[PDB]
Amino acid sequence: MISLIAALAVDRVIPWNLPADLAWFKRNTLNKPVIMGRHTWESIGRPLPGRKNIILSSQPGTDDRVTWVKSVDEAIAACGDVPEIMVIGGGRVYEQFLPKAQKLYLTHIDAEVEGDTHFPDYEPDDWESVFSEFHDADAQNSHSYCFEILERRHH
Ligand SMILES: NC(=O)c1ccc[n+]([C@@H]2O[C@H](COP(=O)([O-])OP(=O)(O)OC[C@H]3O[C@@H](n4cnc5c(N)ncnc54)[C@H](OP(=O)(O)O)[C@@H]3O)[C@@H](O)[C@H]2O)c1
Numbered sequence: 001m002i003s004l005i006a007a008l009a010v011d012r013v014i015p016w017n018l019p020a021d022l023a024w025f026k027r028n029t030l031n032k033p034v035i036m037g038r039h040t041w042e043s044i045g046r047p048l049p050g051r052k053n054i055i056l057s058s059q060p061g062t063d064d065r066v067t068w069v070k071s072v073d074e075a076i077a078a079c080g081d082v083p084e085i086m087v088i089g090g091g092r093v094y095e096q097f098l099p100k101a102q103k104l105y106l107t108h109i110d111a112e113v114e115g116d117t118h119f120p121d122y123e124p125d126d127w128e129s130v131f132s133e134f135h136d137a138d139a140q141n142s143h144s145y146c147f148e149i150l151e152r153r154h155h
């Protein structure tokens with residue numbers, strides 16, 4: 001199955017220091033393939049350890065430490081037969097994979113940020129919330145945040 005995982009500021013914009021959210025990201029992606037667009041790959045700056053890193057780009061790859069693919073269908077195929085594929089962004093990539101996804105792992109962060117790019121719109125009635133957990137800010141985490149998992153119920 002295909003899952004998307006994202007951190008969402010106010011208004012679902014995709015500034016804080018949230019080690020707890022990065023731990024959540026790692027726990028939910030470790031030992032799974034991760035699919036990302038080239039801009040997200042460049043931003044991360046190094047492969048995510050313990051995961052197969054699959055990078056979408058229209059152009060030939062430029063780093064032998066990760067696997068490069070040129071289309072959504074190739075990216076999925078390159079994951080093989082695994083129980084769960086994690087799509088880690090960015091916007092362009094989330095838009096393409098959302099219709100194919102069965103799960104969303106979202107962190108709703110209580111912060112407004114400088115950006116006009118939003119997590120894709122999706123029908124609220126297509127999804128069921130199956131987990132949520134709110135945390136206030138503390139000495140290590142600059143803002144309050146809420147983890148959520150949603151499972152798809154309809155197309
Ligand atoms: N969207 C906005 O409103 C906005 C506003 C300001 C700045 N930005 C900038 O946009 C960038 C992030 O955009 P993002 O989050 O959407 O990027 P992303 O998903 O991380 O990466 C997009 C890149 O992934 C590749 N890709 C995606 N789908 C593909 C497909 N089906 N086949 C082949 N390649 C595919 C392309 O790489 P190739 O280019 O190598 O083909 C594409 O340019 C940042 O640099 C940010 O500063 C965006």
Ligand SMILES: Nc1nc(=O)c2c([nH]1)NCC(CNc1ccc(C(=O)N[C@@H](CCC(=O)O)C(=O)O)cc1)=N2
Nearest residue numbers: 005006007021022025026040044048049088089107
């Ligand atoms: N919940 C969530 N939070 C994010 O920050 C996030 C997300 N989802 N989905 C995609 C994404 C894209 N950017 C990034 C940037 C850095 C790491 C990263 O460094 N992860 C480490 C965490 C451990 C650490 O660095 O202290 C990892 O091994 O996963 C991951 C994704 N970021």
